[PDB]
Design a protein around this ligand. Structure first.
Ligand SMILES: Nc1[nH]c(=O)nc2c1ncn2[C@H]1C[C@H](O)[C@@H](COP(=O)(O)OP(=O)(O)OP(=O)(O)O)O1
Ligand SMILES: [Mn+2]
Ligand SMILES: [Mn+2]
Ligand code: NA
Ligand code: NA
Length: 156
């Protein structure tokens, strides 16, 4: 049995494009990723996801919808990352570059999988098909999956 820490991940997914952020520093630097971070005490997971989206991208949203949950385990780290994945309902402002993320839009036939976390290649297509999912991925370092599980679910 491990302990888990709560994280969020928000995909700003529109009919023909997705907003991703180029991580400028820290965990997963150099890759494109959705927007998110650690849930804080007292806030709901959804509200933490909205907060992190605003802090990281500049976008404010009134509501999200949950699309998945992914547990990440890293060799040499006993704590699991329990990542709650959301998609935006609608957006109403422009993304802003920050110290941590440079946002950029990608057309949905140009999803930059080779420059994203390797697990995204498995679960992001489900997000595009509007399918909810549970996943688990064990990593050696940042590049190598040693074990994983991915399941479509009716309820996240
Ligand atoms: N394998 C992976 N695949 C993926 O798509 N996103 C991942 C991922 N591993 C981590 N992430 C995402 C989840 C979360 O949005 C972010 C990690 O959160 P951070 O540790 O950057 O959070 P915080 O910025 O709150 O932490 P602090 O540095 O303590 O402020 O990266
Ligand atoms: Mn953050
Ligand atoms: Mn972050
Ligand atoms: Na944070
Ligand atoms: Na961060």
């Amino acid at each position: 049995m491990k302990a888990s820490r709560l994280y969020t991940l928000v995909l700003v997914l529109q009919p023909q494009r997705v907003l991703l952020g180029m991580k400028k520093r820290g965990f997963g630097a150099g890759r494109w990723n959705g927007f998110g971070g650690k849930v804080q005490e007292g806030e709901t997971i959804e509200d933490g996801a909205r907060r992190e989206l605003q802090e990281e991208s500049g976008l404010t949203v009134d509501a999200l919808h949950k699309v998945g949950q992914i547990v990440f385990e890293f060799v040499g780290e006993p704590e699991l990352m329990d990542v709650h994945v959301f998609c935006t309902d609608s957006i109403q402002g422009t993304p802003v570059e920050s110290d941590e993320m440079r946002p950029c839009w990608f057309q949905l036939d140009q999803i930059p999988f080779k420059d994203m976390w390797p697990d995204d290649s498995y679960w992001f297509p489900l997000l595009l098909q509007k399918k909810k999912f549970h996943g688990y991925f064990k990593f050696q370092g940042q590049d190598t999956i040693l074990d994983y599980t991915l399941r479509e679910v009716d309820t996240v």
